[PDB]
Structure formats: C-alpha cells, structure tokens
Amino acid sequence: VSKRAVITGLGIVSSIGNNQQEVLASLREGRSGITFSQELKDSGMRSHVWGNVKLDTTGLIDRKVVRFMSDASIYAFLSMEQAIADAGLSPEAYQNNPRVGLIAGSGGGSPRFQVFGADAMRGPRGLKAVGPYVVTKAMASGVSACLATPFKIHGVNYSISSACATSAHCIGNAVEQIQLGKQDIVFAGGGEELCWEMACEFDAMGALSTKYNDTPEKASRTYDAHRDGFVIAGGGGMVVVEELEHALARGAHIYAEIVGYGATSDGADMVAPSGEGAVRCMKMAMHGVDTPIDYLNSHGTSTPVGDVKELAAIREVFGDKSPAISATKAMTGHSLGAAGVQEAIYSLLMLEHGFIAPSINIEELDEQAAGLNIVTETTDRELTTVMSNSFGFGGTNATLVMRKL
C-alpha cells in the first residue's frame, strides 16, 4: 500500500520557549523573542537584535557526548529529548532498532568553531591549541552525527542542507522513508547556532534589520509597510515521524497526519525568488488533499522583496478561497536551518489547541497584501488542515500539509 505517516511527538527550543508548553503560551499572547545583543554590537555589525535562546546549556548534556557538540547540535539534542518523552517512546522501543532513523541538519554547521580552529593554528601554540574536537563541531552533518550516537540510532542517519528550507526538507525526507517502507520511526528536525561569525556575513549583504535596534521587539515586522530585513535567530526542533499502523498499535498520541509534501526549485535567480516555483511547490502538496486549507504558516521573512512574491504565489494557488495567513517569524525571528521544523511545530500547536497565532507588528498592512486574510489577533477556531511554507537561498522550496485524523 501507500503507507501513511503521522506526527506522534515534538520538541522545541526557540526564542519564544524552551518547550512546547512555553511556546504555546508565547504563541497565544503574541510575545516577541527578539532582544538586544551586545555581541552583535561589539563585533562591529549594524544590526543589534537577535532571537536568542534564553537558556544556559552548561552541564545539561553529559560530558562524553557534549565534547563533540556545537550549539546547533545542543539545541537539537535537547529538542529530541523532549520529542522522545512526548511520544512516550521507551529506550527499548527506539534504541538499537534498525527500523528507527534520524534526519536532522543545520544551515552551515558552526562558523564559530570554524574561525576558532584557524585562530589557534596560526597562533604561537600551533596545533597544540586546535584540539581534536573541531571537526565534529564544524562539519555540516554534525547535528546528525552528534545525536545518532548517544541515542543509539541504528536506521538511516544523515543531514540535509538547503538554507532556510533545511529542516523542512528533513521532515519531507522522513515521510518518504516511511512511505518507502524503509523505516517505522524517523526523528526529523534541526538546529542552528547564533553568533557574530555567521550573522556578520548576512549584514554585509544588507539583509538584516538595522533600523529598529533601539526597540528590538519591533524589528521583525512581517507584512508591514515599513519592513527592512529579517532578524537573525537560532534554536532547534525535532518531530517524531511514525508509520500510522505502528503508532496505532502502541497507543501513541497522534497530533496530525502529513498528507502532503512539496519540494520544487526555481532555477532562475540566486537571491530573488520568481514565484512559479512556490506555486508548483504548494500545488504539489495539495494534490490529493480533499479538505481545504484552514491556516497557512507563511515563510514571511520581513524583507522588502521576498515578502510580496510569496503573497502573489498564495493568491494564484487559492484565488478567492484564501486561508487564514500569519507569519510567526514576526515573533521569533529567522532561525534559518531550524525554521522549517520550528514553524511546523507552531502549526501543530495551533491545530492541537484550536487557535491561530497572530502576525504581530503590523501597523499598516502593505498595499500588495490587501484581499488576503492576514490574522493580526489571536483567534479561537477549530482548524483541520494546516500548511507551512519554507523557502531557501538558491530557489529551493518546501511545503508541508498536515491534517488531523
């Protein structure tokens, strides 16, 4: 048969909460996670705001496994611990099991330890100050390598990278493993660190918000007429993707079923999206889905260009049946490699608890956004099918459609 896939557990460490309960409270109240950053100012950048993880990680993970971990792997490790416990998976149910895998990736490893390794080499110590741990912290598959070992994953294990669509492709790839009958359980997610080494190059391109440094909570302002760039952010996320019959037999709590997954490419411009690729990506995820879309978690970066190209794609897909739209990035910032799994978790919390989080910081709706139902205040509503878009540098697109059973 076709084999169906469901979500049986989730875990999140973002700028608006260290778990799904704290995230649920922030989503309802529309509380921002953007704060002032002294590190971004001392390094010489123009943007002084970020969506930081308000949590110290010193000592939370065992020494034998944290010695190889950068911040991206740490946030994803703490997220998977939550997802394992939320799914009720005992150790003998997911450890040393060939039918259990992991697909988690980051945007680009850890530039912090990349720069640290070169500084120690050229120094007076030489190789004596480099250390034998920079390789696992700086590589691209560090999130998957540092997590599959302590959790004793025996199935599939690799990392996916695709700019800001990163963790979205990981979830879609997990659904494919379940559909192909290769796996019964796949942990899917990702993480991202937050440092000046990685954020400074975004500022050199002129894509970060530099006009709202004195009021950080107003910097991320998606769909507003006075936007000037996205706010850098970090964190992690993890979802438990399970085969349907495997989850029903063990009495698991099922959040939703992933009934659609789109993944296309623009193949036009390197920095500016075209729109045609996003339509095919969305239309691909809706094919075979009979129920309409109730809520749409847009990619919404809060950039002067990429914000309108997604609205034109949404308009062509639905036309007059415009679903409720809101961009949660206005609260949390842009977590890059972890944006796909974090926004899918926000959408699952909306579907689970029957509400729509608002797209905050909208003082004057942009003219090219009129006619759409952009929700600006928290609304209680029985949602059935939700959708989340994730676009990435290079024209790559990803879309997930989730529905209750």
Partner: protein, 75 residues
C-alpha cells in the same frame, strides 16, 4: 593548591569522574574510561595549565595519573 592536586583537578573535569576516583595508580583508559581522543585533549589541558610544552613522544608515555604528576613535578 599543590602540583599533585592541580593535575587531579584537571583530569577530573576532562574525563568526567569524581575527584575521589582520581587516585595516583589509576590509568586513563581502563580506569577512567578515557578514549583515544580524550588523551589528546588531556595533555593539551595540562600544557595549558602549568605553562609547559610536552613532546609528543613523551605525551604518549603519560598513561596514568602518577605519570602526569611526575612529569609536571620534574619540569
């Protein structure tokens, strides 16, 4: 602190064991669970702490807590 207990402090936090388990005759590998990569970082933390430089041929000789104390005491 004495030289002996400054080395024992370093070994404790680098391998993840209690200070009581760090006795003199204890070896890093079979007693303190140090893998092959832990040995490299251990000699780096000793040579960052007493401001000494350890040749690699002698660093491979240091396999016990007493051997590390004897080297720092002799230099």
């Amino acid at each position: 602190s004495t030289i002996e207990e400054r080395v024992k402090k370093i070994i404790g936090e680098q391998l993840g064991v209690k200070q009581e388990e760090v006795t003199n005759n204890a070896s890093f590998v079979e007693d303190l669970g140090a893998d092959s990569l832990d040995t490299v970082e251990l000699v780096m933390a000793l040579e960052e702490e007493f401001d000494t430089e350890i040749p690699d041929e002698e660093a491979e000789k240091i396999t016990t807590v007493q051997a590390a104390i004897d080297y720092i005491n002799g230099h």
